[PDB]
């Protein structure tokens, strides 16, 4: 029971599964699409100090990954290189075949130390961390991601109508992922 949204010509309706409207025509698997949309488009604060408050560490919950085929250009990506004060890794290494988000103008690369009191870093609002055509619930080490969400669509019968430089900004952080976190931007 996941909302499948059907796009009629010049309209979008959330397909009601109990009712059956056959007037929509789905003649091939080419018409089924998944799309990733960035939270930026809803007006959420993108500043690094504000953004970092939405993530938090948690143990006991296994990570999960789901693929998506098409995405949106991001203005802001993030890249974490975090270590514990003794010197250890609190973010897991990227599994095979997880590359960074393809297109983002600014990459906020944050390095520093924190308590990292948990096995994995999750999103407190239930959104996903979007990578290159894979959305995962957790943050991986050294791999640029965007915050986003996934939707599923039935495209219209007509194919045709529907479906570069980057900069890096470096930050130092102490007490990362805490109530009060201290940043110095270079």
């Amino acid at each position: 029971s996941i909302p499948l949204g059907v796009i009629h010509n010049s309209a979008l309706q959330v397909s009601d599964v109990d009712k059956l409207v056959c007037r929509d025509k789905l003649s091939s698997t080419n018409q089924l699409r998944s799309v990733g949309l960035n939270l930026e488009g809803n007006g959420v604060a993108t500043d690094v100090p504000s953004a970092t408050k939405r993530w938090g560490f948690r143990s006991g919950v296994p990570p999960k990954v789901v693929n998506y085929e098409a995405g949106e250009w991001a203005e802001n990506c993030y890249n974490l290189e975090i270590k514990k004060p003794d010197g250890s890794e609190c973010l897991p290494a990227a599994p095979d075949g997880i590359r960074g988000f393809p297109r983002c103008r600014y990459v906020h690369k944050v390095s520093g130390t924190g308590p990292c009191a948990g096995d994995f870093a999750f999103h407190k609002e239930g959104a996903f961390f979007l990578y290159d055509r894979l959305a995962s619930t957790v943050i991986y080490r050294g791999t640029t991601f965007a915050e986003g969400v996934v939707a599923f669509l039935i495209l219209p019968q007509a194919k045709k109508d529907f479906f570069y430089y980057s900069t890096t900004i470096r930050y130092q952080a102490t007490g990362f992922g805490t109530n009060e976190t201290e940043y110095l931007f270079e």
Partner: antibody
Amino acid sequence: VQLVESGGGLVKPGGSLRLSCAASGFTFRNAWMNWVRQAPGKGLEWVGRIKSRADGGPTDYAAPVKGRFTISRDDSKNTLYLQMNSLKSEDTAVYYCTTHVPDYNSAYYWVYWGQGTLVTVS
Amino acid sequence: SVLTQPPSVSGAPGQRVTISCTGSSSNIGAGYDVYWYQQLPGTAPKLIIYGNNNRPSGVPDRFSASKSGPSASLAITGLQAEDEADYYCQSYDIRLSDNYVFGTGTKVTV
């Protein structure tokens, strides 16, 4: 894992000195280190921290001792050098170099202190 | 800017005693591990307790520990004569850019 510190001698206040911590038993390239000193009749105390060279983070110093002391390392010799300049009053204590190194299982990082040296001013 | 601890504790042989280390929001409150070291007079401190009751090597199961809120405790059951030592609690402060803070010191007596 073993550490040995040397350089312990009496110095007239106002001079300079070099304390050397030489270790063996672990990959010395990728470990953080801290210099900690213990005064007689008092609890332990912290003086400085040096980060790994690969990370490149700036070394940090305590609040009273920031400035005069200078920490560094040398990988080709596997050593950690602490240089103290213009020694004043009450800088009199044992010095230990502490590192955190895993056990090849990486599940945790034990602490491995050193024997330390004596440094007195007069 | 130092961790607190009781001046000294006492107890009969074979019973249990607990040593308290009370921190602040920046250290233990934030979520950092607590390290316990035992210094016998004349030598250097070694590690006794790390994190959640983890023993490095050759440590009697008599030593345990807990953490709650901004405080922590070390529990030792079955005090013997050789337990005379100074115990120090350590953590990482934040207002110090994530760096050592040490406890005062406790005289455990048997």
